[PDB]
RNA sequence: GCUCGUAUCAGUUUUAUGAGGUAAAGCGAAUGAUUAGAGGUUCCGGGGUCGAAAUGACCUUGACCUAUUCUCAAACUUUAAAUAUGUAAGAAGUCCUUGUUACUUAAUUGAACGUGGACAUUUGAAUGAAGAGCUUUUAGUGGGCCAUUUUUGGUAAGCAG
RNA sequence: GAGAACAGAAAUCUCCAGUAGAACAAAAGGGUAAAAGCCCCCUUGAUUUUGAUUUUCAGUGUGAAUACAAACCAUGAAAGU
RNA sequence: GGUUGCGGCCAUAUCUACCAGAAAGCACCGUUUCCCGUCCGAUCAACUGUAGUUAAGCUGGUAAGAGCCUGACCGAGUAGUGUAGUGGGUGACCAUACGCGAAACUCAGGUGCUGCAAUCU
RNA sequence: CGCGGGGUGGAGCAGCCCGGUAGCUCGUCGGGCUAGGAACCCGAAGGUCGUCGGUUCAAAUCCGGCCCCCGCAACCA
């Protein structure tokens, strides 16, 4: 017995019930998946920069 | 006016397509190198009939290109042989000519035993001063139409160097 | 006349590039000397640019912008000649000394002279322009031949050589200078020392002389009738270059020419466009009678 | 069977152009893309390393990653009832600046500009921009325009 | 259920900016088809005034030539909609000789992230917002069918997709 | 398209013209002209380590692999690849 | 304004055929001792600033030029199409309402523009 | 209207351990034997391999189309 295959009916409906909402955005995205050459100087970048601050307020 | 746009040869081909390879392509080109000074080079053979017994890269013809005072001169013994009669067909449409000769020998060269008889082409391409712009890698230039070579003009400098008449044909 | 290409083929046809079209520059070679690494935002990537024409070498440093390329220094062989000495400026040995000259030239302009002084003392050996300790690192530029043949002993490694002695980082191998030997990959110092001061040169001059007087006059006359020997290069050597010719700005331009009387007598030998009302006019002339036969 | 490889349906979306075949002009190598610019992607067919998948075509992102030919993109992707974040590694040939950013970006300095000029003398500048308005009365002068009248034209056969 | 006293959002528009090869159109535009007539030319063969009569005072595939002309394409196309579609329209935003770095630069050059400074009734289109955002867990379901419009196979079907 | 002594419709040889009407292993479609095609030189990056990504997608696996990082290399004058 | 070198957009730049080009500038160019690959110093390499060559390259002008580009109440609000009716028509299809709106065609206009560094009576 | 093989001189077979630009037998023809036929002996000719289109390493054997010789399956309500 032959069967219906496929159809992309209802599925529109169903994905609008509770749907499309966007991604929630941060501030501070993940530094993964970014160069690591960039993420090493980052690393020593930011630890100047708590350095540098806490004595400024010290 | 014509201050240097003189016809002259660009170069002399002289061309030696034997039927097959070994021994007769050898001394094909032990002539050609005799006769040229310089050593020839060999043509393979592009693909295969049916006709001619011949394959891919057999190593079939031999030709050697010579420019300067030597082209002048081997033509001038090469025109010998020809009585300095050549067709009107004869000269190409762009302003070239060859003629073919068979039996090397004719041209006033001393017959070796080995070498034997070996039927040559000698083609002439002309031009004039100023063609470097259409072979030189900076600028390719394409020759104005009136620096270029034509039938009659080819045909008019032949006839005005060395006496040499066509028929009328 | 009926001697006309397809419409179709004029259509379709997708002209190449204008400076691809007029034989100047390979865009294949182009893109790989110009695209620099991007994590390096806006850093220029600089070429020594060298470009060979009779009579003239021309070394620019050349960075890449949108609108256009920027020149940041240039040095032409041209410099010298109206004055009187009109020799060799075309060869190895003039090559060097304007990729010697764009090198002090482009380091003086960014202050970078007093450091990074290159090879002083010419020895012909091969070697790169090496960072000094806690001091900047030497200004980077890359070789830029155009469509120039890259050849062992070719006349565009003199400005190479020249520019990585007068203090440029230039990027370069020994095996393309003259004396560089193909069976051994070792360089032979004294002859590309040679080349570099005109050895090369000066040797066809006493075999010349001692062979074919007649073409030693045809060529290199200039040489004879300026007395010109051997004894001129200590001039030229300490004398010239360290005192004097090292910062020749002393030369007459106060005076700045007037490009409009330039723009004048140009302008008044061109050849001038023929307006909208002319060309319905000529096409007039033509259908009435010439074309029309009354 | 079916056949669904990574440039299936991808014909006439990666073809070059109409009489723009051959190399790239240099410029788009020289276009710097920083970490938040906006970029469009547009598949450029002759480069083929660093493609986009043809889903990307037409789809605009925002830098994340600067490495030495590439930029990453992240691109807002709806998966079912959801966006997902995806991160392409896209060749520069690839893509390009958004214009309406750029755009944009001289609104925001044309409004700190206009706030600053109105700050000097307080005139209520309203940086804020309005849909067009319905229009306002005018009048229409008849002299030299004297209305021409018009009917409906026959039907004829014009074959 | 969990995290706030005005929710950073939206099956919508606008403005701006992209992407697309469908409809239509086109074929005296490429590819592929396709109807007719308009010059010459023995580069093998169909024939003769005259008998190879020499490129011979003729036409027939044109074996060498361009100007037209009728009609077309799901797997053709220069062009190219409508509808649908991506992004943006800011407080995580914008304007200083570095403040940090081991990255990068020729170089305090940049890159990224920062300290201090200047910006609530307009906080940088419209309309709405019914509270945002978030988590855990679990039921049923996993035979579908019918309008309009687009559309494939089929003569068609209350047919199949 | 333009010649030749047995050379011819197909062996060469030489000039022209030539937007690719060629070639690139294969099916088809894209792409490619100072190349991605053809010839020459040098090579093994068709290598190490383990992460991030794209496509099918449950955003699991598999297959392809896109961009990097840390090594070692090849090539090239070099940029680079 | 000419020219050279490096470019950007990549025909408003290409193509055909003629006409013109002063100074500046390729090279008419000339040569093969030297680095440099081959049959060929033709290309490529190197060496010179010569009789003085603008013949060609190149640039400009021309052409009811081909092509290309721009524009148009030119065709044409046409083709097409989003939405609507218990509109019409046996049907095929069509008309209408609220919107969006081509391409051919025709007619005009246009013969690259321009950045950086030099150089030029 | 599905699945398979095969097509080479007048006739029957050789290119099927991927290639001798086509060979071997009968038949036919010529000569010789014999007082002619036959049988026998000695020689010769005969098919660019069904047709068309694909790699261009002698490609058409091996690939894709149409025709022809055939063969098996054509059932269970």
Known sequence: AKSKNHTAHNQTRKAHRNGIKKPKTYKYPSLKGVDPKFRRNHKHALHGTAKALAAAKK | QNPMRDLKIEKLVLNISVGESGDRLTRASKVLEQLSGQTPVQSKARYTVRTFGIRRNEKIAVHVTVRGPKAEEILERGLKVKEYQLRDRNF?????????????????????????????????????????????????????????????????????????????? | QKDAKSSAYSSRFQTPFRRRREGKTDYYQRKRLVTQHKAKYNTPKYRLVVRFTNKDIICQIISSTITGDVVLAAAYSHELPRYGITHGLTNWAAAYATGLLIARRTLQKLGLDETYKGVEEVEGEYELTEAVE?????????????????????????????????????????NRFPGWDFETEEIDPELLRSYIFGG???????????????????????????????????????????????????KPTEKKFTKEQYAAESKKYRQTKLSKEERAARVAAKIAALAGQQ | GKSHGYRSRTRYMFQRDFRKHGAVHLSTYLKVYKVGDIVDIKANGSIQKGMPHKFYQGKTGVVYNVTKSSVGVIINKMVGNRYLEKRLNLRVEHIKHSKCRQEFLERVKANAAKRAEAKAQGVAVQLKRQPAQPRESRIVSTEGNVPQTLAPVPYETFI
């Open chain 3, 134 to 174: 806690d001091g900047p690192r030497p200004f980077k530029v890359f070789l830029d031949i155009g469509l120039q043949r890259t050849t062992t002993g070719a006349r565009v490694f003199g400005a190479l050589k020249g520019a990585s002695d007068g203090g440029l980082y230039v990027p370069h191998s020994e």
């Open chain 2, 92 to 169: 190409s449409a762009t302003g070239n000519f060859g003629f073919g000769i068979d039996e090397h020998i004719d041209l006033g060269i001393k017959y070796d035993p080995s070498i034997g008889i070996f039927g040559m082409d000698f083609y002439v391409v002309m031009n004039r001063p100023g063609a470097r712009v259409t072979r030189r890698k900076r600028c390719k230039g394409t020759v104005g139409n009136s620096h270029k070579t034509t039938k009659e003009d080819t045909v008019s400098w032949f006839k005005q160097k060395y006496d040499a008449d066509v028929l009328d044909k």
């Open chain 3, 200 to 250: 090369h040169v000066s040797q066809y001059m006493e075999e010349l002389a001692d062979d074919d007087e007649e073409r030693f006059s045809e060529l290199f006359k200039g040489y004879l009738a300026d007395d010109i020997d051997a004894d001129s290069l200590e001039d030229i050597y300490t004398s010239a270059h360290e005192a004097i010719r090292a910062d020749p700005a002393f």
